[PDB]
Curated annotation (Swiss-Prot), chain A:
This is Nitric oxide-associated protein 1. Belongs to the TRAFAC class YlqF/YawG GTPase family. NOA1 subfamily. It comes from the Eukaryota. Homodimer or multimer. Interacts with mitochondrial complex I, DAP3, MRPL12 and MRPS27. The chain holds residues 600 to 685 of 698 of the full protein. Involved in regulation of mitochondrial protein translation and respiration. Plays a role in mitochondria-mediated cell death. May act as a scaffolding protein or stabilizer of respiratory chain supercomplexes. Binds GTP. It is found in: Mitochondrion inner membrane. The gene is NOA1.
UniProtKB/Swiss-Prot annotation, chain B:
It is linked to Combined oxidative phosphorylation deficiency 32: An autosomal recessive disorder due to deficiency of mitochondrial respiratory chain complexes, I, III and IV, and characterized by delayed psychomotor development and neurodevelopmental regression. Additional variable symptoms include poor or absent speech, inability to walk, and abnormal movements. Required for mitochondrial translation, plays a role in maintaining the stability of the small ribosomal subunit and the 12S rRNA that are required for mitoribosome formation. It comes from Homo sapiens. One of its GO terms (biological process) is mitochondrial translation. GO terms for molecular function: structural constituent of ribosome. This is Small ribosomal subunit protein mS34. Component of the mitochondrial small ribosomal subunit (mt-SSU). Mature mammalian 55S mitochondrial ribosomes consist of a small (28S) and a large (39S) subunit. The 28S small subunit contains a 12S ribosomal RNA (12S mt-rRNA) and 30 different proteins. The 39S large subunit contains a 16S rRNA (16S mt-rRNA), a copy of mitochondrial valine transfer RNA (mt-tRNA(Val)), which plays an integral structural role, and 52 different proteins. Keywords: Disease variant, Mitochondrion, Primary mitochondrial disease, Ribonucleoprotein, Ribosomal protein. InterPro entries: Ribosomal_mS34. GO terms for cellular component: mitochondrial inner membrane; mitochondrial small ribosomal subunit; mitochondrion. The gene is MRPS34. It holds the Pfam family MRP-S34. Its main location: mitochondrion. It is found in: Mitochondrion. Signal peptide: none annotated.
Curated annotation (Swiss-Prot), chain C:
Component of the mitochondrial small ribosomal subunit (mt-SSU). Mature mammalian 55S mitochondrial ribosomes consist of a small (28S) and a large (39S) subunit. The 28S small subunit contains a 12S ribosomal RNA (12S mt-rRNA) and 30 different proteins. The 39S large subunit contains a 16S rRNA (16S mt-rRNA), a copy of mitochondrial valine transfer RNA (mt-tRNA(Val)), which plays an integral structural role, and 52 different proteins. Belongs to the universal ribosomal protein uS12 family. Keywords: Mitochondrion, Ribonucleoprotein, Ribosomal protein, Transit peptide. Residues 6-26 are annotated as: Disordered. GO terms for biological process: mitochondrial translation; translation. GO terms for cellular component: mitochondrial inner membrane; mitochondrial ribosome; mitochondrial small ribosomal subunit; mitochondrion; ribosome. It is found in: Mitochondrion. This is Small ribosomal subunit protein uS12m. The keyword Ribosomal protein applies. One of its GO terms (molecular function) is RNA binding. It comes from Homo sapiens. The chain holds residues 31 to 138 of 138 of the full protein.
RNA sequence: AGUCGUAAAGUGUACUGGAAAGUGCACUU
RNA sequence: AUAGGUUUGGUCCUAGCCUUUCUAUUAGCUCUUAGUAAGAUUACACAUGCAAGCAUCCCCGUUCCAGUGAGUUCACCCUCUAAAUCACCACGAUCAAAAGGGACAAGCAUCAAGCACGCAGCAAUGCAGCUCAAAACGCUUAGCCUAGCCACACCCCCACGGGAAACAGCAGUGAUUAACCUUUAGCAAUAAACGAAAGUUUAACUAAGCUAUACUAACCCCAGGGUUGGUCAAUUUCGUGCCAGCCACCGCGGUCACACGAUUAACCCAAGUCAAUAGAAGCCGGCGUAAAGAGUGUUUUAGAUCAAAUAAAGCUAAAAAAAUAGACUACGAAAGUGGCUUUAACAUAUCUGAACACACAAUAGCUAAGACCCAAACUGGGAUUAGAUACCCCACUAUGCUUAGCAACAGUUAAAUCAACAAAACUGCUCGCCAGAACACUACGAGCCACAGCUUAAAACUCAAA
């Protein structure tokens, strides 16, 4: 398996706690939507295997933070809410 | 019910680990004589044992210095000698030492018990083999040591009932028409007072688990 | 309904009771966002003292401040209870006087 | 709101570009 | 419920909302003493100290007690039968696992199909079966059936392994919530563990600490809280003037306010009072006009007692559709059927029971083709007052045509019949339907469209009405 190569990322001004500022996409595996806090500029480093590429895009689902629950214990995780069907 | 397979896996592997990590007598019943602690577990022995632990010998500490590990020989205990005037001893019939021991001073033994001058019919396993309590009877002393004349062991054969039980029994008899004046009695010849220091069945006893 | 129909349908099933503005709680703590005044519905005329508050549940709500004269400002902490202000439509919450920053009405 | 002014016939539906309503079709008294 | 208030110009009915009663939590203000009972909001994170030893070594115990309510028909009964206690030689009793049989919460059908869920045979294999609208399968909610029981013991259902470094044991702390008890003492009693035993250990427990949360009993002196328009017990004087303000519902406030502020007095309860919240508290009542019952027939697991039609061929008289009879009221399940002849032909020996089965029938609106005498919305043309006739005349479309497609049933008139109005009231029996306005409103969106328009909704929310 290739090693994970790093790539530095800077995010734009945080547009509140309900609207994503970026989706970091790990090729076809999936993506992570980041919501900074207001005015906050964040510094990130994304690691992906050497052969493949990491792509930061404007969010596909920007209001995806809102569908969640409450923090469980001291864990960073939030309880998962199943989305409405289609 | 979603079958719980990890529980079965854990039970099986734990059982396997136990059966392949059975500690030996040399490890279980070793002792540190300066601190009087078991190195295997770190637990201290009770205070009342301390002196004997520093003075007396374990059974195989004696048997490992004898031909055939001392089959046929007589072994007594210090506590028996201090407690009882009548002879108490084991006549050894089988010995299985712990071969891993450096001095071959741990293991199991079987014998015929004579307690307070009364011999048993069969041979059974000896308890407290790992205790620092044992003494070997010299061969030139055995005849003097075993000499015992059975004294008349005539004890009470019946006792009175407790007052209320006696009154209730008499009342029941009188109600059923009986007019007997014979005192109700409780039979105790069948209840034999077995001394608290009589050897127990080493076969039924448990063993310390490895850990 | 016949006996068979009542056996089929079963005992009457009362719908779950509706939660009010306090979500079934005696009181709620809130942070004042802004103070203002509202006009009653008209058999009546006045300038009722009200304030918008963010409740501990995160929801925002309009609350009525009882008594003559209040010193509530933005960012102040208040305790709000139930009870409709009958003349103000949509105002179902009332500020508790004498708790946290909201003090008692001054005498006279 | 006044401190403002003044004394055969129907019901539907469709179309309506000479529509202050008309015509067409079906119904009611 | 022994009920009460509130819709109207007024009466009656229906219906929602609220008041009066009893608890619990929290908040405001106010609180004297004694005894007892009960006692974080959070399965969020935890500094610190304790909560398991005993015992002549072996063993035994730390698998109990104590805690929590996250998850959730493992708890109950019967059968069989381990481990444990006592017989201790077992006969067997007691206690109770695993296994087999039975029973066992609530909502949602806008969750209707599940998809191998069965049987027979020693097996090989064979059959195609099993559950389900009397609710399977599925989603959501919740500890329960309380001398107590079930489940869990930081998380990954489990715990070899991993995350990671654990008070849901006691005391205590941080965060959070409207919610907020001591970092006390002793094993003297009981219980448990161990010991042959004197005994030892125990944050179980016992005895104390704190708290108006409750109960009980006081108190020589010492009372507060709320209310006073009606429901509902109880206002004097001023101040203010639709302002300030007040109310549970109805409602008050515009210069005489018993309704707001103060003051006086009264009323209720009282070491409390009572503001908010949450419970307790409710369908055997109705369906013509208030919410709720017809298109017709057959069948259907169950339940009940009540065991001049229609289709075909032919034929026609007056002027293709059928005057008289017909003042008839027959046939047909309904819609419908009334020119003549002939041929077939008009189910069923109890009743109720279909959205989902089969037949019909009618009503809209579009789609394909076809006929076109006649009539005819629209569309043209001609004539007319002094905004002609909207209205008369002519021509001709869509269309009118033809195909093929998209409360029941049986018995009663005895009773006060009898909210009214309709249509005199009734019983029994069954199915379907009904639990304020609200078959409300609304486009977050979706489809068609393709920048700007069209079609398509429930719920909240509000109110004391409708
Ligand atoms: K022991
Ligand atoms: K629970
Ligand atoms: K668990
Ligand atoms: K004790
Ligand atoms: Mg026209
Ligand atoms: Mg018309
Ligand atoms: Mg009423
Ligand atoms: Mg405790
Ligand atoms: Mg047994
Ligand atoms: Mg069982
Ligand atoms: Mg739960
Ligand atoms: Mg676990
Ligand atoms: Mg604690
Ligand atoms: Mg914890
Ligand atoms: Mg409390
Ligand atoms: Mg306490
Ligand atoms: Mg202590
Ligand atoms: Mg106490
Ligand atoms: Mg007043
Ligand atoms: Mg209080
Ligand atoms: Mg109706
Ligand atoms: Mg029928
Ligand atoms: Mg024509
Ligand atoms: Mg019916």
């Amino acid at each position: 398996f290739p090693p994970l190569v790093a790539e530095d990322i800077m995010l734009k001004e945080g547009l509140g706690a309900s609207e994503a500022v970026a989706d970091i996409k790990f090729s076809s595996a999936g993506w992570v939507s980041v919501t900074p806090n207001f005015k906050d500029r964040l510094h990130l480093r994304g690691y992906t295997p050497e052969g493949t590429v990491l792509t930061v895009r404007p969010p596909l689902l920007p209001y995806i933070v809102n569908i969640k629950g409450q923090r469980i214990k001291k864990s960073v995780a939030y309880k998962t809410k199943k989305p409405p069907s289609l | 019910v979603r079958p719980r397979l990890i529980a079965e896996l854990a039970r099986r592997v734990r059982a396997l680990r136990e059966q392949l990590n059975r500690p030996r007598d040399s490890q279980l019943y070793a002792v540190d004589y300066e601190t009087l602690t078991r190195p295997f577990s770190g637990r201290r022995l009770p205070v009342r044992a301390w002196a004997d632990v520093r003075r007396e010998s374990r059974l195989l500490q004696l048997l490992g210095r004898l031909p055939l590990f001392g089959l046929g020989r007589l072994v007594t205990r210090k506590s028996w000698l201090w407690q009882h005037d009548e002879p108490c001893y084991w006549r050894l019939t089988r010995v299985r030492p712990d071969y891993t021991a450096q001095n071959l001073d741990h293991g199991k033994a079987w014998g015929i018990l004579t307690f307070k001058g009364k011999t048993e019919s069969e041979a059974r396993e000896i308890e407290h083999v790992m205790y620092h309590d044992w003494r070997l009877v010299p061969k030139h002393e055995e005849e003097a040591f075993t000499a015992f004349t059975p004294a008349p062991e005539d004890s009470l054969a019946s006792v009175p009932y407790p007052p209320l039980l006696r009154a209730m029994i008499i009342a029941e008899r009188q109600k059923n028409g009986d007019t007997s004046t014979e005192e109700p009695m409780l039979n105790v010849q069948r209840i034999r007072m077995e001394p608290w220091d009589y050897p127990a069945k080493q076969e039924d006893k448990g063993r310390a688990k490895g850990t | 309904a016949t006996l068979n129909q009542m056996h089929r349908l079963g005992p009457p099933k009362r719908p779950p009771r509706k939660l009010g503005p306090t979500e079934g709680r005696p009181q709620l703590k809130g942070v004042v966002l802004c103070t203002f005044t509202r006009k009653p519905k008209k058999p009546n005329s006045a300038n009722r003292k009200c304030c918008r508050v963010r409740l501990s549940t995160g929801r925002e709500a309009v609350c009525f401040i009882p008594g003559e004269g209040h010193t509530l400002q933005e960012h102040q902490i208040v305790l709000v209870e139930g009870g409709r202000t009958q003349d103000l439509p949509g105002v179902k919450l009332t500020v508790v006087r004498g708790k946290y920053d909201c003090g008692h009405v001054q005498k006279k």
